[PDB]
Amino acid sequence: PMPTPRQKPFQSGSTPLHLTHRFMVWNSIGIIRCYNDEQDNAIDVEFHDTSIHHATHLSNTLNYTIADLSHEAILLACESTDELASKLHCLHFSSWDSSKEWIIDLPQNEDIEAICLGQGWAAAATSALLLRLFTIGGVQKEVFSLAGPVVSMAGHGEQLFIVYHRGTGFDGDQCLGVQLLELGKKKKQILHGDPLPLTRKSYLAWIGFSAEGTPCYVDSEGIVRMLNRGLGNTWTPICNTREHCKGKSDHYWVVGIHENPQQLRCIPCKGSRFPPTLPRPAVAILSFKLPYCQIATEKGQMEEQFWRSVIFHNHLDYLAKNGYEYEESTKNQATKEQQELLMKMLALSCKLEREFRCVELADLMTQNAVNLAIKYASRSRKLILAQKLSELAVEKAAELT
Amino acid sequence: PMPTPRQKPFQSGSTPLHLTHRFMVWNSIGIIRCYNDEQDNAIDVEFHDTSIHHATHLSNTLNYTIADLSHEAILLACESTDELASKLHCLHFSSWDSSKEWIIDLPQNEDIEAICLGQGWAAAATSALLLRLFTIGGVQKEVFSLAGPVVSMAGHGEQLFIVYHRGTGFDGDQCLGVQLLELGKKKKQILHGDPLPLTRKSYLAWIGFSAEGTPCYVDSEGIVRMLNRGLGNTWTPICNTREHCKGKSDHYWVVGIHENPQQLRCIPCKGSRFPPTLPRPAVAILSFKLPYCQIATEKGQMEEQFWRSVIFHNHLDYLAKNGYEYEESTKNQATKEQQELLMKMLALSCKLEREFRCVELADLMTQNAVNLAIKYASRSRKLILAQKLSELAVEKAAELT
Amino acid sequence: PMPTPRQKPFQSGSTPLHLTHRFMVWNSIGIIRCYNDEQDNAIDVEFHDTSIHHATHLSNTLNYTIADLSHEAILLACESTDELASKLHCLHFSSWDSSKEWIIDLPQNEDIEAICLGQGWAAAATSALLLRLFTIGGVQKEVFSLAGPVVSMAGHGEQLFIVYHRGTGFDGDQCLGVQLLELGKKKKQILHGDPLPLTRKSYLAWIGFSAEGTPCYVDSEGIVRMLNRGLGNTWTPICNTREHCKGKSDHYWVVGIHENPQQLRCIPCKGSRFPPTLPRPAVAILSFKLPYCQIATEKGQMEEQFWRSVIFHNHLDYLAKNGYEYEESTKNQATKEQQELLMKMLALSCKLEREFRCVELADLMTQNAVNLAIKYASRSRKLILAQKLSELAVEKAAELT
C-alpha cells in the first residue's frame, strides 16, 4: 500500500484556477466569475434573484483567487506575495451605512487557504492551521487552531462546517475529518473531528449546506451524503449522480441542495467534471434517491420514499429547536405522507401473510394509524394480527402517559 | 516503520472459511456450523437450551459465508457472483405468523462484508462502506455511511457495536475505531469513531456484548477489555487469557462473556487459535481478573476484587436508565460486598499505621460504613484518624443535603 | 511523503536524561533535580515557597528517571531491569500520619513511561498501553487502556490531560490525540481522543494546566495554545515565544502558565532548547498575545485585548460550575474591562462612519453599555445608528424575559 496524495483546499462551486474565464463560486444566491488575463483582470457577481442585489463588477487587481457569496456580502481572498500579505476582503452590501467594504491583512507568512460566509460572519482557514472569525462588518472575533490542513469550508446561519485531513490515506483513499461548530450565543462543537465517510479511492468534490440548513457533501464518485440529525449525526447517502451518467466521462457538478421541495441543483458535464464558463450552462434538477435494496419492487420503492421523507424533514425539528422560523403545516404534511406510506406497506405486507412485518410497520405509526390498522387487520381477517396491533396500541398509550 | 496489513472482516465465534467443517458462529444462544463440500453443502443450527428452538438444518445452496444467531432469528449472508447479487437471508422463527423467512438482494456490485443481530433488528456492513438496517421481519430501515472498512459487528438490544479502520497502522499495529450507536426511539451515537485500544502488534480477535449488555472485545494477545460506563466510556481490561496458557502455541477462543455470575466462556485450544469442529469441544470457564499491581499481597488482592465488583455492576445502572428489567437485590449485594472489601482494606491499612490511606478508603464508603469506621479507629486507637473520619462523615451528610 | 519518527514520552519541565545534572521537573510548585553519576546518585527537591515544605534530599538508588511535584506529594518512577520491576514511588508529605512514603511494583514486563499528579491522586501510563490510577496514599484505583502510546501527561484537581499518538504523521508532522478526563464523583471523558492541533513539522514541547486549571500546551515552534471552554473546547493560540527570540538558536523553556494575573513563566535559552542546570536560571515572564491581524492598529490592538480577556476569564465559570472557590470581583472586573474595550471600539468604529460595525460591537455589550451607546450615537449624531441600537436593546430585553 502507498500514501495517497492529500487533496488540496478548494471552494465548492469553483472551476480550476488555470482557466482564463473561471467560476469562483456558483451557489443558490448567485455566481461569481473571475477573468484573469495579461490585459485585464475582472470579477463579476450575478444574482439568480435580481432583486437581492444589482450585478456587481470589480476591477480585480489583488489577484483574489478565493471567493464566496451570500445573500448579504461578497467575500474575496488572496494569498501573499513577496510584496504584500494575504488579504481578506469583504463587500457587505446589505449594510444600511455608507461604508461598504473592508479589507484586512493576515500576519506575515500566513496565507488564506479557505474562506466561507455564514449569517453575519465570515471565516478564513489559513496556512498556519488557524481558523479566524470575522463579523461581516470587519470585527475580528475568536481564533482557534485546526487539527489539520483544511480541504473546504461552508457556512450557514450560525453553523460552521469544516473538512480537513485527519492523516494520510493509503491506496487512493483520503483521510478526512469533519469539525462541526455552532457559533451562536452558546458556542458548541457538534462534531469533534469525526471521520468523514467517503467512497473508496475518491476525494471530496463539494461541501455546503442545503437551503434549509443541513450539512451535505459530494464524493468524486458521484455519491451525495447528508447529515442525519435523527440518526445520531451520522451521514446518510441521499444521491448517486453516476446513475444519471451515461458514460464514464459524464459527470454532474453540484451547485445547490434543497430539502423542501427536494431538488439536487447541479450542472450536467460531458467532457470533464466541471462546466466551461460559457455559454452559460443550464442548471439541471436531479431527484434524490436513497440507495435502498430492490428499489423496483413496490415494497422497496415505498421504503425508500418513507426514509427519504424522514431524513428530509429532520431540518424542521432543527429549525424548531434553535428558535428559527418553520411552518408547522410542513411538519403535518410530512407526518401524513409517512403514515400513508406506512399504511400502504402494511396492506402490502398483509396481502403476503407476513403479519409480524405488519406489526413491525405499525410500531412506526401514530396511534390513530395503528387504531385504523387494527380494523384493517380485523377485516382480511388476520384476527391474531388484529390482537397484536391492539396490544401495540395499548403499549403506545402507556408510553404517552 | 512500514504499513501494517489491515485485518479483514470477520464474525466473532467463527472458524476460517477454508475449513471443510467450520463454525459459522458460536455464541451464548447456540452454534451454527457450515459444511461446504463438492458433494453437499449443509448448515446446521444447534441451541444450548433445546427449549428455545429445535435443531435446524438448511440445504446450503447460495454458499452463505456469514451467519449470526440470536434467541429469535438466524441471519445468513453471501457475497455476489457474476450471476447473482450479495444476499441477506433471515429465518426469524420466533415469529407467530406463517411466513417465516425472508431474503433480499443488495444492489449490483455491493457485497455483504459483515452482519449482526440485535433485538428485533439486523444490520449489514457492505463493500460500499454502507450500514444497512432491517427489522427481523424484513423491513428496510435507516442506512448510513461507514467511516472506514468494517472489521466486525455485534448487536445487543438496541445497541450496535461497530469496529472499523480509522487508518493505517505501522510496525504491526492496527488502527481501529469504534462506532457505538443506540437504535431506540431516540437514536444516539454514543461513540463517534473513538480509537479502539489494542495491545501493540496485535489484531482484533473477538467482539460482542456480555449477556447483560456491555460491549466487550478480545485482543489477539489474549487481553479481554470491557466498556467502562462508570469511567466515561473508557475501556478497562478485565482478563488476560495468556496467563491461563502454558505454551506460546496455547490459546483460548472466546464464545461468551457473562457479568452475573462472572464467567468468561471460551474454548481451550492447543494447536491453533481456534478449535477443530469435531469432536465437539468443551466450553471452559475462565475467571476475570483485572491487571492490578501486587495481586499476591492482601491489599492488591482486595483492590482487584473491589474494582472488579464495581465495573461488573455498572450494567445494572445501564439497565435501570434505559427502563430494562433489573433486580435490585443484585445492586444491594454489590454494594455490601464492596463495603466489606473497603472495611477490610481500611482495617488492613490501619494495622500498618497508614491512617491517611484509611481516610481515603473511607471516602469511597457509604455513610453507615464510615460511621462504623469512626468507631473502629476510635478503638485501635488512632484518635486523630477517628476525628478525620468524623469530619469526612459530616462532609458526606453535607453533600446529601 | 514519508513517516515521521514518533516523538518519545517526556515529562514537561524536564531536561534530557543523558545530562549529568538534569532537571527532573520544574513547575509552579518547585524544582526536582537529579544528579546521576558513577559516584553518587542524588535527587533534590526545592520549593519556590519555602513554607510549603522543607528542601528534600533523597539518596537515589533505584535510578528513578521520571518525577512530578505537587503541593502535596513527590512522585518518582523507574523502569524495569532484569532484576527488578518498574516501580512507582510516592512521598506524600502533606499527610498528617506517620507513614509518609509508599512504593509499588508494576507487573512483570510493564514499564512506566509517563506519570503525573493531580489533587489527591496520581497516574501512570505504562508500556502495556495502560493508565493506572492511585490515591496519593497508595490505593490502586481504576485502570483503563490507552488508545495509543503516551507522549505526556498532566494533572490538576480532578482533571487528567493525556496526549498520545493517534497514528503516524508524514513529512515531519506528528499525529497526536488528546484524552481529557474528569475524575470526580461523576467520571467524565471530556475529550474522546480529539486530534491535537500542532504547528506543521513540529512536535509537542510542554503540556500542563494553568494555575487556575485550564489545559495548555506548547509547540516546538514556540506556539502556546490553551483550551477554550467558551468555544466548544477548541484550542486557541495564546502565545508565540518565537517573536521574543532574536535568532533561530534562541528558545524559551516553559515552566508555568498563569491566568490571573496573566503571565507565561518560562526560562530564556540561547544555546539549546533547555537551560543548563547551573547556574540557576532566572524565570522570565512573557506576556500572552493572541495572533490577531493588524495588531499595530488601534482596532486590532483592542480586539486582541478583548478576546484575550474573554478566554482568560473562562476559568472563572469553570470554577463556578464545579463548585470550586472563585472570587466574583474578578468576574465583575473582567466584565467591565471588556465593556470598556467594546465602548472604545464602538467609538472608534463610529468616527470611521462604519455604523453597522458599531451595531455588531453592541451585540456583544451588556444592556447598560448598549443603552449608553444609544446616546453616544445620538450625539455624533448617527441618528439611524441610534435607532438600530435602540432596536437591539429592545431585542436584548426580549431575550432576558
Q: Which residues on chain B are in Cβ contact (under 8 Å) with C99? A: 352-357
Task: Work out whether the CA dihedral C286, C291, C293, C298 comes out positive or negative.
Answer: negative
CA atoms of B132 and B142, how far apart (whole Å)? 7
Please report the number of interchain residue pairs, chain A to chain B, with beta-carbon separation below 8 angstroms: 120
Please name the residue of chain A whose CA is at the shortest distance from the CA of residue B167. A169
Put simply, the answer to whether C197 touches A143 (Cβ < 8 Å) is no
DSSP A173: -
- Per the structure, how many domains does chain C have? 2
Instruction: List the single best residue of A357, A382, A388, A400 to mutate versus B (max B Cβ within 10 A).
Output: A357
CB B116 within 8 A of CB B69: no
Rounded CA separation B80/B97 (Å): 30
> 495502560: which residue's cell?
C130
Chain CA centroid to CA A140, Å = 27
Residues B85-107 as b or e (16 or more Cβ within 10 Å = b):
bbbbbbbbbebebebeebebebb
Residue A19, judged by CB atoms within 10 A of its CB (0-12, 13-18, 19+), counts as middle
> Can you read off the three cell numbers belonging to residue C171?
513529512
Taking each helix axis from N to C terminus, what angle separates B328-351 and B367-380, rounded to the nearest 10 degrees?
Answer: 20
Distance (Å, whole) CA C22 – CA C364 = 49
Alpha helices by DSSP H, listed for C226-327, are 298-311, 314-321
Q: Quick check: B334 and B314 in contact, CB under 8 A?
A: no
Query: How many Å lie between the alpha carbon of C21 and the closest alpha carbon of chain A?
Result: 37
E strands, C244-342, are 251-259, 262-269, 284-286
Closest by Cα among B127, B179, B106 to A291: B106
Contact B68, B29 (CB under 8 A): no
How far C311 CA sits from the closest chain B CA (Å)?
Answer: 26
Task: Find the residue in B nearest to C194 (Cα).
Answer: B194
Way it was determined? X-ray
- DSSP-derived letter for residue B222 is S
Report d(CA C291, CA C238) in Å as an integer: 7
3-state secondary structure of C149: coil
Dist. CA A386–CA A380, nearest whole Å: 10
Q: For residue C365, what are the CA distances in angstroms to A399, C304, C351, C355?
A: 46, 17, 19, 15
Distance CA(A249)–CA(B265), nearest Å, equals: 56
Closest CB to C188 among B200, B232, B236 = B232
Cis preceding linkage at B166, omega within 30? no
| Cα–Cα distance measured from residue B60 to residue B44, given in angstroms and rounded to the nearest whole number | 9
Are A250 and A359 found together in one domain?
Answer: no
Q: Where are the beta strands (DSSP E) in A64-158?
A: 66-69, 74-78, 87-91, 101-105, 112-117, 121-126, 130-135, 140-145, 150-156
Cell numbers that stand for B203 in this block: 489484531
Q: Which chains touch A (3 or more CB pairs under 8 A)?
A: B, C
Query: Which of these three, A288, A321, A339, is where a domain ends?
Result: A288
The 10 Å Cβ neighbour count of residue C365 is 21
Could you give the CA distance from residue C214 to residue B343 in angstroms, rounded to a whole number? 37
Per CB-CB distance under 8 Å, the chain A contacts of C228 are: 142, 144
Range of the domain at A189: 1-288
Enclosing H/E stretch for C401 = none
Question: Within 13 Å and on the Cβ side, how many CA atoms surround C229?
Answer: 15
**DSSP H/E element including C326:** none
C320 and C270 part of one domain: no
> Using an 8 Å Cβ cutoff, are B53 and B46 in contact?
no
- Chain B residues near residue A355 by CB distance under 8 angstroms: 96-97, 99
Q: Show residues of chain A in contact with B105, CB under 8 Å.
A: 293-294
Q: Which residues of C touch A146 (CB under 8 A)?
A: 197
Per the listing, cell 495564546 goes with C238
The C-alpha cell 426469524 sits at: B92
Write out chain C residues lying below 8 Å of A181, CB-based.
232, 234
Residues of chain B neighbouring A195 (CB-CB closer than 8 A): 147-148, 166, 177, 193
**Shortest CA distance to C159 belongs to which of C111, C207, C92, C195?**
C207
Asked, as a colleague might, if the bond just before A261 is cis with ω within 30 of 0, I would say: yes
- What is the Cα Rg of chain C in Å? 24
| Angle ∠(C247,C248,C251) on CA atoms, nearest 5 | 90
Q: Of B288, B307, B332, at which residue does a domain stop?
A: B288
Closest Cα partner for B245 from B206, B280, B277, B272? Answer: B272
Q: Which residues of C touch B176 (CB under 8 A)?
A: none
Q: How far is C169 from chain A (nearest CA, A)?
A: 7
Whether C360 sits inside 8 A of A139 (CB atoms) is yes
* CB pair distance less than 8 Å for C193 and B194: yes
Report the C-alpha gap between B329 and B314 in whole angstroms.
14
Residues A305 and A284 in one domain: no
Residues of A with CB under 8 A from a CB of C: 3, 92, 95-99, 102, 104-107, 120, 128-130, 132, 135-149, 166-168, 177, 181-182, 187-189, 192-193
**CA-wise closest residue to B125 among B165, B157, B156:** B165
Per DSSP, A206 falls in state E
Determine which of B91, B126, B134, B140 to mutate to test the interface with A (most A C-beta atoms within 10 Å). B140
CB C133 within 8 A of CB C140: yes
List the single residue in B92, B145, B192 with the smallest CB-CB distance to A197. Answer: B145
**Beta carbons within 8 Å of B248's beta carbon, 6+ residues apart:** none
List, in sequence order, every beta strand (DSSP E) within B262-315. Answer: 262-269, 284-286
Please identify which residue in the block is written with the cell numbers 468524486: A220
Q: Report the relative pairing of strands A121-126 and C21-26 from DSSP bridges.
A: unpaired
Cβ-contact A175, B167 below 8 angstroms: yes
CB-nearest partner of A353 from B97, B167, B193: B97
Looking at the fold, whether A144 and A274 belong to one and the same domain comes out as yes
CB contact under 8 A, C107 and B196: no
Question: Which residues of chain C are within 8 Å of residue A139 when distances are taken between CB atoms?
Answer: 303, 345, 357, 360-361
Measure CB to CB from residue C137 to each of B175, B294, B357 and give the nearest one. Answer: B357
Helix (H), strand (E) at residue B297: none
What does the DSSP 8-state code read for residue B375? Answer: H
> Most distant CA pair in chain A: distance in Å?
85
Q: B173 by DSSP, 3-state: which?
A: coil
Element (H, E) at B94: none
C-alpha cell at C392: 437591539
Cα B26 to Cα B47: distance, rounded to the nearest angstrom: 10
Please state whether beta strands B130-135 and B121-126 pair in parallel, antiparallel, or not at all (unpaired): antiparallel
Determine the residue among B357, B358, B380 to mutate to test chain C binding: the one whose Cβ has the most chain C Cβ atoms within 10 Å: B357
CA B129 to chain CA centroid, Å, is: 24
- Report how far apart, in Å, the C-alpha atoms of C235 and of each of A387, C215, C226, C313, C353 are: 58, 9, 6, 15, 35
Q: Which residue pairs, CB below 8 angstroms and at least 24 apart, start in B15-20? A: B15/B274, B15/B275, B15/B277, B16/B274, B17/B65, B19/B277
What SS3 state is found at B71? coil
DSSP state of C279: S
The whole-angstrom separation of Cα B159 and Cα A262 is 32
Q: Tell me phi and psi for residue A47, to 5 degrees.
A: -120, 130
Å between C19 CA and nearest CA of chain A? 34
Q: What are the chain C neighbours of B352 within 8 Å (beta carbons)?
A: 99
Distance from CA of C159 to the nearest CA of B (A): 13
Which residues of B are less than 8 Å from A225 in CB distance?
145
The answer on A97 and A136 residing in a single domain is yes
Most B CBs within 10 A among C92, C96, C145, C183, hence the mutation to make, goes to: C145
Same domain, yes or no: C227 and C374: no
Quote the CA–CA distance of C74 and B335 in Å, as a whole number.
34
Using the structure block, give the residue that is written with the C-alpha cell 464510615.
B370
Q: What is the torsion angle, in degrees rounded to the nearest 10, for the CA atoms of residue A300, residue A303, residue A307 and residue A313? A: 120
- For residue A7, the number of C-alpha atoms closer than 13 Å in the C-beta half-sphere is 25
Pairwise CB contact (< 8 Å): A105 & C1? no
- Distance from the Cα of B226 to chain A's closest Cα (Å) equals 23
Residues B276 and B376 occupy one common structural domain: no
Contacts of C365 in chain A (CB under 8 A): none
Q: Quote the CA–CA distance of A223 and A231 in Å, as a whole number.
A: 19
Q: How many residues does chain B have?
A: 401
- Return the DSSP state at A382: -
Listing from the earlier edge strand, what are the strands of the sheet with B21-26?
B21-26, B30-35, B42-47, B56-58
Q: How do strand B234-240 and strand B223-228 relate by DSSP bridges?
A: antiparallel
Query: Does A295 share its domain with A284?
Result: no
What does the alpha-carbon distance between residue B186 and residue A231 come to, in Å, rounded to a whole number? 8
Residues of B in contact with C148 (CB under 8 A): 195, 197
Same domain, A49 and A128: yes
CA distance B282 to B300: 33
* DSSP structural state of residue C170: B
Mind giving me the DSSP string for C18-70?
TSSEEEEEE-SSEEEEEE--SS--EEEEEESSTTT---EEE---S---EEEE-
Same domain assignment for residues C66 and C188: yes
For residues A11 and A25, is the Cβ–Cβ distance under 8 A?
yes
Nearest to B13 by CA among B265, B285, B254: B254
CB B232 within 8 A of CB C189: yes
Show the cell assigned to B72.
Answer: 429469535
Q: Distance between CA atoms of C69 and C25, rounded to whole angstroms?
A: 7
B374 torsion bin: left (phi>0), alpha (psi -120 to 50), beta (else)? alpha
Q: After which residues is chain C broken (C to N over 2.5 A)?
A: none
Alpha carbon of A271: minimum distance to chain B alpha carbons (Å): 26
In angstroms, the first-to-last Cα distance of chain A is 58
Q: A133, C228 in Cβ contact below 8 A?
A: no
* C-alpha pair distances (Å), A140 with each of A148, C262, C345: 22, 22, 11
Same domain, B164 and B312: no
Number of helices (H), then strands (E), belonging to chain C: the values are 6, 23
Secondary structure of residue A60 in the 3-state scheme: coil
Residue of chain B with shortest Cα separation from A226: B144
| Cα three-residue angle A153-A159-A160, rounded to 5 degrees | 25
The chain A residue lying nearest B92, using CA atoms, is A356
User: Chain A: nearest CA to B217, how far in angstroms?
Assistant: 22
Measured between beta carbons, the chain A residues lying within 8 angstroms of B137 are 354, 356-357, 359-360
Residue B95: closest C-alpha in chain A: A356
Of the candidates B171, B165, B154, B169, the one whose C-alpha atom is nearest the C-alpha of residue B217 is: B154
Among A361, A342, A355, CA closest to A381: A355
Chain A CB contacts of B192 below 8 Å: 191-192, 194, 233
Distance, in Å, from the CA atom of A374 to the CA atom of A11, rounded to the nearest integer, reads: 54
DSSP B377: H
β-pairing verdict for A87-91 and A74-78 = antiparallel
CA distance B10 to B24: 10
* Residues A312, A270 share a domain: no
Q: Which residues contact C330 (CB under 8 A, 6 or more apart)?
A: C260, C313, C316
Chains that touch B (3 or more CB pairs under 8 A): A, C
Please give the grid coordinates belonging to residue B204. 482484533
Listing from the earlier edge strand, what are the strands of the sheet with B121-126?
A: B112-117, B121-126, B130-135, B140-145
Documented resolution in Å: 2.8
- Calculate the CA dihedral of residues A300, A301, A306, A311 and round it to 10 degrees: 90
Mutate to test the interface with B, among A224, A231, A302 (most CBs of B within 10 A): A231
Torsion of the alpha carbons at B323, B326, B329 and B335, rounded to the nearest 10: -70
B14 with B255: CB under 8 angstroms?
no
Q: Which residue in the set B98, B139, B144 is minimally distant from A361, CB to CB?
A: B139
List of residues 6+ apart from C105 with CB closer than 8 A? B293, B294, C84, C85, C86, C87
Rg value, chain A, Cα: 24
Q: Give the C-alpha separation, C80 to C152, whole Å.
A: 19
Least Cα separation, residue C270 to chain B (angstroms): 34
Domain edge (last residue) among A267, A288, A309: A288
Is-contact A191 A135, C-beta < 8 A?
A: no
